[PDB]
Amino acid sequence: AITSVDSYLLSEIKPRLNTVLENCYIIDEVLKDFDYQTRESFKEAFCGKNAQHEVTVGFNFPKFKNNYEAHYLIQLGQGQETKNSLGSIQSSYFEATGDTLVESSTAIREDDKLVFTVSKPIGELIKVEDIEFAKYDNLQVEGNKVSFKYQTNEDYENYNANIIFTEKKNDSKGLVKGFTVEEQVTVVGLSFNVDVARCLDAVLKMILISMRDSIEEQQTFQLQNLSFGDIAPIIEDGDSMIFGRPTIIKYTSSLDLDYTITQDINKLTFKERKD
C-alpha cells in the first residue's frame, strides 16, 4: 500500500479548511494573538458562509492560473529510507484486510442478541465506544454485523454508538513486506498582501494539529516535524510581488506489499523406519 502523502494532504485540507473558515468563533481563537486590524480584515474577507472571497488549494506547475489573492500550494519534496526490519517483514495476517473505518450504528433487537450493522464486512473489530464486553456477553462478529447477547443489557435496545472496524476482502492469509520511509513535503501560502499570508500560515498550523487526531494520521502518518522558512517574495516580475512563507512537513510511513501464502499444511502422517 504505497502512500501518496500529497493526496492525503489535499483530502484532509479541503474539507477541514472550509469548515474552519465557515465559523467565526474558531477563527478568533486561532487569530487570538494577531492585532485587531489584520484579524478582522481577514475575517471580513474569507470568514463566514457568506464570504465572497474564497481560498483555493492546488499542486505545483498547473497550466491554468491560481487565485493569487489567497492560495495553498503543495509540492512533493524529498524522501528517504530510515529503518528496516529482518527479511523486510512488517506483519503477518490471516485475513486480507483493507482500510480501517469508523462507523456509527444503532443497536437492533434480535431474540437472543442486540446487533449493530455496518456498511461492509467487519473483519477485525477494534473497539465499540465505551463498551467492555464481558465473556457472558459473548461478543462475536458475523458478516457485516457485530452481536452481543441481550440479557442484563435490556435497557440498550436503542443504544447509539460509534464502531471502529476494518475492511475484510479475502480469507487468503499472507505476509507483509516493506520498510519505513521518512518523507518531506512542502506547503506554502501565497498572496500579494503579506498580512494575509501570515494569517493564512497560522490557520494552516491549527489544522495540522487537528490532523494529529485523525485516523489516517494516527495509524499511517506519524511523527510530525514542522519547519518554517522566511517570508520571501516569490515573484518580482509583475505589477506587485507575491509573498509566501514556505513550510516543510515530515512524515514516517510504511511502503508495504502483500505476499500471499498457499502452502497450508492440513495433513500430518508419521511413519516409522523399516529397520
Binding site: 465505551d130 464486553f133 464481558a134 457472558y136
Partner: protein
Amino acid sequence: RKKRDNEIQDFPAEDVQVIVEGNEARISMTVYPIRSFKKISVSLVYKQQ
C-alpha cells in the same frame, strides 16, 4: 489488592463488564464467595495384632 490481603480467595478476571451512556456508567462483576468447613465423617476399624 484484596486477594493480596487475603480478603478474597479467588475471582474471575475476565468476567467484568463496563458500559458508559452519557453521564451514567454500568458496572457488572462476579466474585466467588468463601466456603467454610462443615462436615466430617469418620469410621474406625478394630483389628488384632
